[PDB]
Amino acid sequence: KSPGDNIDFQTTILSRFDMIFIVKDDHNEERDISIANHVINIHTGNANAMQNQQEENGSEISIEKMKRYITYCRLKCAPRLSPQAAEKLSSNFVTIRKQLLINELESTERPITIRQLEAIIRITESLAKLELSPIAQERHVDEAIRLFQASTMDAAS
């Protein structure tokens, strides 16, 4: 017994979230200077604000415009994906399903589910929805699995 949650919470984290990202890295001497010197360039001298303004002259979208772009592309588009792209995803699932069984065959007790596959079909198509496209292709999907497996490398550890 304990206050708050219980190990049961191990399910709702892995089963009901479409990506889980585990983000710690260990006090790298140059990283904590890189971020620090960037964070100094935030607090005053506004060089990031200056840069974001200059990059608004260059290639960035200003917050109010990105929002209006989001709401436009959210409402305007009702996408779909071709069976040409679709076959890549079973080709991924059957392999990842076949491989990582071995790690539960070895009873490591950690997962690989259609809840995750059905997430991929959404991340693929939202990535293709940014483009204002009714359709999607492996051109997007190969990026979505690369984004997805960054999560599985966090589930296993």
Binding site: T11, L81, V94, R97, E118
Partner: protein, 605 residues
């Protein structure tokens, strides 16, 4: 009445007579009423030795027929409805010609801007016709109202009578007549009252508030008062989704008369009321059947494979588990609910528990049922913040100083309840379910209330293995994590497994992809005619099977993985009876018991 009708009224009548001459569907319908009453009158009169006088008008029939009369009912109902009923009240006298009361109107269809939620029902367009949708929120105790009063003049044996009129009997503001109840004759004699030669009518008001899923959530509810004359009084109850049509009168004279601010009393005179169905409502879907729709059922009912396809067509969104959704289909059918002579009723509803690995469809399957069962309510179990899904708190401030309200399970009195996350739901409910399951009665014993109310309804349970996951190499009882009586109270317990593989798992991708890239509406009409008409008696060809199997499992399964009890005898009867209902069989047959066995073979082993 006493004034001479002007052409602005005489035209309205004869213009409406050309409509009804054109659309005979109303002339023959009013006739069909006095067919029905005279058959009953003959039944009462000529063997021992009604329908409430209103018709629904399709407003689509007016638009193409009489454009200015369309706008008249909508914009000026007080000048167009009283003459249309005055036509019908002489059409009724024209259809009948047997020897020897009012006739009334109702409407249906689209009203454009005039159909609006009471969030936007406003003091524009008061006098116009309105339609409103929402929840009926309370109902008044149905009072009798006076119209005609009758008296006796004992000095002569004459009878005297008086008649009353008020703000709710005419759409036009008739001149008020505050007549005085006659306790003395014109001559000065005494009087007595002939109660029941006098006539009465039911008064009711019901208060409707905006439907909460269309509501711009966060805001307060806003609600308006609907008055019902004699007819519709019986056909509303609190919490149901209701559409009303009527006249949004703005009556009285507050402030400007008498003395002083708050403005005029605004309300709707309800001339049409319909219940309607939305998710988790106290009324069934109740689709109508044509003589064609029944024909398709009878084509099917004798084909020796319907139960396999019908069991599959439920849930294309899910792969496999035909062996389960077979039973959930049988829950919609149910048993016969036999009630014994001079002895207690006996359960018909079959209650099902789903459990398995958390990856599975348990939470999603129930949203087929809740979307496609005749009547259903869904509860999270934990989060039934009242007494529970059943009983309720009980107090009042109104004139009567008590009231009652019903929980979800008392509201779902015949149909379905979807219970999910079942083992979160605390003991306070579980022990209340032990009261329900095989007695289907509820008791409470508050300060004032000490009485029994029915709950003849059916349950799906969905649960999770407490250890987060299960596999059959781990002993199969402790994973259920519930008192052994509940594992008896629920009739079929199904264990769903996903210790992963590849072979079956292979096909799943293309089925899901096909699912991102028989049918539902017939099932409702298939189930309700089966439910209404069919009541299978047992047959000896199947009564033996339920004895053979039940008696064997008590030798075997009491030496193996599961408990067997006299409770699970009757579950064989119900399931057999349900499949006979799938057959529309007038009686049970042996095949149904072999199906009952099969479902338990899968559920147990």
């Amino acid at each position: 009445t006493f004034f001479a009708p002007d052409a602005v009224f005489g035209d309205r009548v004869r213009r409406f007579q050309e409509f009804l001459d054109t659309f005979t569907s109303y002339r023959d319908s009013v006739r069909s009423i006095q067919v029905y009453n005279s058959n009953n009158a003959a039944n009462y009169n000529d063997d021992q030795d009604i329908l409430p006088h209103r018709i629904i008008i399709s407003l689509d029939d007016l638009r193409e027929f009489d454009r200015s009369f369309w706008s008249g009912i909508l914009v000026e109902p007080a000048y167009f409805i009283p003459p249309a009923e005055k036509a019908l009240t002489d059409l009724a006298d024209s259809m009948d010609d047997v020897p020897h009361h009012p006739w009334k109107l109702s409407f249906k269809g689209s009203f454009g801007a005039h159909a609006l939620s009471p969030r936007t029902l406003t003091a524009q367009h008061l006098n116009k016709l309105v339609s409103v949708e929402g929840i009926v929120t309370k109902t008044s105790l149905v009072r009798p109202k006076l119209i005609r009063s009758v008296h006796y003049a004992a000095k002569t044996g004459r009878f005297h009578y008086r008649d009353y009129t008020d703000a709710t009997t005419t759409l036009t503001t008739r001149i008020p007549t505050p007549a005085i109840y006659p306790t003395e004759d014109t001559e000065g004699n005494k009087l007595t009252t002939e109660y029941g030669y006098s006539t009465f009518i039911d008064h009711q008001r019901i208060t409707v508030q905006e439907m909460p899923e269309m509501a711009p959530a966060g805001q307060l509810p806003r609600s308006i008062d609907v008055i019902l004359d004699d007819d519709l009084v019986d056909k509303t109850k609190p919490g149901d989704r209701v559409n009303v049509v009527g006249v949004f009168k703005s009556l009285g004279a507050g402030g400007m008369n008498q003395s002083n601010l708050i403005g005029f009393k605004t309300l709707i005179l309800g001339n049409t009321v319909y219940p309607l169905h939305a998710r988790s409502t106290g009324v069934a879907a109740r689709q109508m059947l044509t003589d064609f729709d029944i024909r398709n059922i009878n084509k099917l009912s004798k084909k020796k494979d319907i139960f396999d396809i019908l069991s599959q067509s439920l849930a294309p969104s899910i792969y496999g588990h035909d062996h389960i959704k077979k039973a959930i289909l049988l829950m919609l059918m149910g048993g016969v609910e036999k009630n014994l002579e001079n002895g207690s009723h006996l359960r018909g509803d079959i209650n099902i528990l789903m459990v398995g690995d958390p990856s599975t469809a348990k939470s999603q399957l129930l949203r087929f049922v809740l979307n496609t069962a005749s009547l259903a309510i869904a509860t999270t179990g934990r989060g039934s913040s009242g007494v529970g899904l059943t009983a309720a708190v009980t107090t009042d401030r109104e004139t009567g100083e008590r009231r009652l309200e019903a929980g979800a399970m008392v509201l779902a009195d015949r149909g379905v309840v979807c219970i999910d996350e079942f083992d979160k739901m605390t003991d306070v409910d579980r022990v209340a379910i032990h009261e329900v399951m095989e007695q289907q009665t509820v008791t409470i014993a508050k300060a004032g209330i000490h009485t029994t109310l029915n709950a003849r309804c059916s349950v799906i349970a969905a649960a999770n293995p407490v250890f987060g996951q299960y596999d059959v190499n781990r002993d199969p009882h402790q994973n259920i994590a519930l008192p052994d009586s509940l594992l008896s109270r629920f009739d079929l317990l199904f264990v769903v497994t996903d210790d992963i593989n590849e072979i079956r798992d292979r096909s799943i991708s293309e089925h899901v992809l096909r699912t991102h890239r028989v049918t539902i509406p017939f099932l409702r009409k298939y189930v309700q005619y089966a439910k209404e008409r069919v009541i299978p008696q047992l047959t000896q060809e199947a009564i033996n099977v339920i004895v053979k199997n039940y008696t064997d499992l008590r030798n075997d399964d009491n030496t193996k993985k599961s408990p067997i009890t006299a409770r699970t005898l009757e579950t064989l009867i119900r399931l057999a009876t349900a499949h006979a209902k799938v057959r529309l069989s007038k009686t049970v047959n042996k095949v149904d018991a072999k199906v009952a066995a099969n479902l338990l073979r899968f559920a147990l082993l």
